[PDB]
Design an enzyme around this catalytic site. Structure first.
Site, PDB file in Angstrom:
ATOM      1  N   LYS A   1       4.920   3.096   1.742  1.00 38.95           N
ATOM      2  CA  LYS A   1       6.249   3.040   2.401  1.00 38.95           C
ATOM      3  C   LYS A   1       6.354   4.307   3.253  1.00 38.95           C
ATOM      4  CE  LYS A   1       9.195   0.409  -0.935  1.00 38.95           C
ATOM      5  NZ  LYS A   1       9.159  -0.762  -0.015  1.00 38.95           N
ATOM      6  N   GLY A   2       7.186   4.290   4.263  1.00 34.90           N
ATOM      7  CA  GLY A   2       7.446   5.484   5.089  1.00 34.90           C
ATOM      8  C   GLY A   2       8.786   5.357   5.757  1.00 34.90           C
TER       9      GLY A   2
ATOM     10  N   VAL B   1       3.509  -0.456   4.679  1.00 34.41           N
ATOM     11  CA  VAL B   1       2.088  -0.848   4.886  1.00 34.41           C
ATOM     12  C   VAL B   1       1.703  -1.758   3.726  1.00 34.41           C
ATOM     13  CG1 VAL B   1      -0.243  -0.025   5.385  1.00 34.41           C
ATOM     14  CG2 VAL B   1       1.713   1.339   6.059  1.00 34.41           C
TER      15      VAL B   1
ATOM     16  N   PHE C   1       9.134   4.689   8.716  1.00 33.06           N
ATOM     17  CA  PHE C   1       8.871   3.658   9.755  1.00 33.06           C
ATOM     18  C   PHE C   1       9.024   2.212   9.207  1.00 33.06           C
ATOM     19  CE2 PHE C   1       4.862   4.938   7.768  1.00 33.06           C
ATOM     20  CZ  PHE C   1       4.484   3.727   7.224  1.00 33.06           C
ATOM     21  N   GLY C   2       8.924   2.021   7.892  1.00 31.91           N
ATOM     22  CA  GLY C   2       8.744   0.678   7.302  1.00 31.91           C
ATOM     23  C   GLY C   2       7.705   0.680   6.190  1.00 31.91           C
TER      24      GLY C   2
ATOM     25  N   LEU D   1      -8.430   1.468   5.048  1.00 28.43           N
ATOM     26  CA  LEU D   1      -9.061   2.729   4.654  1.00 28.43           C
ATOM     27  C   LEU D   1      -8.813   2.915   3.154  1.00 28.43           C
ATOM     28  CD1 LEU D   1      -8.007   4.812   7.757  1.00 28.43           C
ATOM     29  CD2 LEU D   1     -10.264   3.846   7.347  1.00 28.43           C
TER      30      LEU D   1
ATOM     31  N   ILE E   1       0.862  -1.208   0.000  1.00 30.47           N
ATOM     32  CA  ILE E   1       0.000   0.000   0.000  1.00 30.47           C
ATOM     33  C   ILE E   1       0.879   1.232   0.000  1.00 30.47           C
ATOM     34  CG2 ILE E   1      -1.612   1.415   1.273  1.00 30.47           C
ATOM     35  CD1 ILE E   1      -2.767  -1.183   2.378  1.00 30.47           C
TER      36      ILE E   1
ATOM     37  N   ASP F   1       1.930  15.220  13.644  1.00 34.18           N
ATOM     38  CA  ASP F   1       2.284  15.129  12.213  1.00 34.18           C
ATOM     39  C   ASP F   1       1.016  15.179  11.357  1.00 34.18           C
ATOM     40  OD1 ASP F   1       3.893  15.070   9.956  1.00 34.18           O
ATOM     41  OD2 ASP F   1       4.247  12.906  10.021  1.00 34.18           O
TER      42      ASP F   1
ATOM     43  N   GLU G   1      -7.805  -1.600  10.386  1.00 32.61           N
ATOM     44  CA  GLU G   1      -8.857  -1.639   9.336  1.00 32.61           C
ATOM     45  C   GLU G   1      -8.245  -1.087   8.032  1.00 32.61           C
ATOM     46  OE1 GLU G   1     -12.075   1.267   9.815  1.00 32.61           O
ATOM     47  OE2 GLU G   1     -10.790   2.365  11.255  1.00 32.61           O
TER      48      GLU G   1
HETATM   49  C1  LIG Z   1      -5.292   1.760   2.821  1.00 37.54           C
HETATM   50  C2  LIG Z   1      -4.670   2.120   4.128  1.00 37.54           C
HETATM   51  N1  LIG Z   1      -5.296   1.750   5.261  1.00 37.54           N
HETATM   52  C3  LIG Z   1      -4.747   2.086   6.435  1.00 37.54           C
HETATM   53  N2  LIG Z   1      -5.364   1.753   7.582  1.00 37.54           N
HETATM   54  C4  LIG Z   1      -3.541   2.820   6.436  1.00 37.54           C
HETATM   55  C5  LIG Z   1      -2.648   3.313   7.429  1.00 37.54           C
HETATM   56  C6  LIG Z   1      -2.862   3.280   8.841  1.00 37.54           C
HETATM   57  N3  LIG Z   1      -3.010   3.318   9.975  1.00 37.54           N
HETATM   58  C7  LIG Z   1      -1.565   3.929   6.773  1.00 37.54           C
HETATM   59  C8  LIG Z   1      -0.388   4.642   7.328  1.00 37.54           C
HETATM   60  C9  LIG Z   1       0.307   5.599   6.585  1.00 37.54           C
HETATM   61  C10 LIG Z   1       1.390   6.261   7.157  1.00 37.54           C
HETATM   62  C11 LIG Z   1       1.847   5.863   8.370  1.00 37.54           C
HETATM   63  N4  LIG Z   1       1.207   4.959   9.131  1.00 37.54           N
HETATM   64  C12 LIG Z   1       0.117   4.369   8.606  1.00 37.54           C
HETATM   65  N5  LIG Z   1      -1.774   3.755   5.420  1.00 37.54           N
HETATM   66  C13 LIG Z   1      -2.963   3.120   5.204  1.00 37.54           C
HETATM   67  N6  LIG Z   1      -3.515   2.788   4.030  1.00 37.54           N
HETATM   68 CL   LIG Z   2       7.276  14.705  13.448  1.00 34.36          CL
END
Ligand SMILES: Cc1nc(N)c2c(C#N)c(-c3cccnc3)[nH]c2n1
Ligand SMILES: [Cl-]
Ligand SMILES: [Cl-]
Length: 331
Positions: A21-22, A27, A24-25, A95, A19, A141, A93
């Protein structure tokens, strides 16, 4: 890590796709065979720094989960977490796409004042929840990328990314928030509280309607200069207590402050939010001329609320309950 599609974890999760990248790692989208539903799994890098900061994220999400209010449902739901191959994994969940993607899809021309209002009401309700005394959570943030639609057909949103978040009085970092959304108290090196999220929100709402960041600084000095263009010199009583005031400003005999200038900004307070919004000129770039819900009176309410969110003084800046009572939100 780089997780293959089709990979099965713990006879429970089947990994589908990346989904996002960040720092942190990553998704990933995954199928949970137990609940029988798709989930977003945030996979933290297997390094001490990221693990330790994600453990704070897990703690703060669990704290919010055990406060069933009605104001709790504008935060992403953490379903559970586990350690796998030495990665902390947070299961959320699913999103939809984020509000930066929404602006990109408008070719950065902005969404209507009516859709801006719907986002503002949800976000103010989220900030009221975090301000619950037993939580007192500072997101730290807030930005369009960290606000996700619940459903691509609908205008419901949830906040994500509690990776920088802290409780009041549990501050770690002086340097926080994404620069365009960074509060004057953080630019000025001052101890911060929940009011820094309201600053961010005011910046966010202007951008959601104009299509462009309100304050797009290239570095902290450019940031403060762009805030001063719109809002003028910060008040003396703030600059007098600020450790970084002399990064940006210079004090004079009579107890007054002015910008440091470098080599050649609009003079302080002359880039009027009235003109950025186009209150009397058919909205941003005059692109809303004639559209229902975009009258001068509608615009003046929006402008008033934003200027309360962008108070330099974190003590007098509008707080979430009072923002929800603003005329902008009355039909
Ligand atoms: C489609 C989707 N669903 C999510 N629940 C998240 C989600 C969460 N919580 C993050 C996200 C993005 C950046 C840092 N941490 C989480 N990206 C996402 N995409
Ligand atoms: Cl920050
Ligand atoms: Cl952005």
């Amino acid at each position: 890590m780089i997780v293959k599609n089709g990979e099965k974890w713990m006879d429970r999760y089947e990994i589908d796709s990346l989904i996002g990248k960040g720092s942190f790692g990553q998704v990933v989208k995954a199928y949970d065979r137990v609940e029988q539903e798709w989930v977003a799994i945030k996979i933290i890098k297997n390094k001490k720094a990221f693990l330790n900061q994600a453990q704070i994220e897990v703690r703060l999400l669990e704290l919010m989960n055990k406060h069933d209010t009605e104001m709790k449902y504008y935060i992403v739901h953490l379903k559970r977490h586990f350690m796998f191959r030495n990665h902390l994994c947070l299961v959320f969940e699913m999103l939809s796409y984020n509000l930066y993607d929404l602006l990109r899809n408008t070719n950065f021309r902005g969404v209507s004042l009516n859709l801006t209002r719907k986002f503002a009401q949800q976000m103010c309700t989220a900030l009221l929840f975090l301000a619950t005394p037993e939580l007192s959570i500072i997101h730290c943030d807030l930005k369009p990328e960290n606000i996700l639609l619940c459903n691509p057909k609908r205008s419901a949103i949830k906040i994500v990314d509690f990776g920088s978040s802290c409780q009041l009085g549990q501050r770690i970092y002086q340097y926080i928030q994404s620069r365009f959304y960074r509060s004057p108290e953080v630019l000025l090196g001052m101890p911060y509280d929940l009011a820094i999220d309201m600053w961010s929100l005011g910046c966010i709402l202007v951008e959601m309607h104009t299509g462009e960041p309100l304050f797009s600084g290239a570095n902290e000095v450019d940031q403060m200069n762009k805030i001063v263009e719109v809002l003028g010199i910060p008040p003396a009583h703030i600059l007098d207590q600020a450790p970084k005031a002399r990064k940006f400003f210079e004090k004079l005999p009579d107890g007054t402050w002015n910008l440091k200038k470098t080599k050649d900004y609009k003079p302080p307070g002359t880039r009027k939010l009235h003109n950025i919004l186009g209150v009397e000129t058919g909205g941003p770039g005059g692109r809303r001329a004639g559209e229902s819900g975009h009258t001068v009176a509608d615009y003046l309410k929006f402008k008033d609320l934003i200027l309360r969110m962008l108070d330099y003084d974190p003590k007098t800046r509008i707080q979430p309950y009072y923002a929800l009572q603003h005329s902008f939100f009355k039909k």
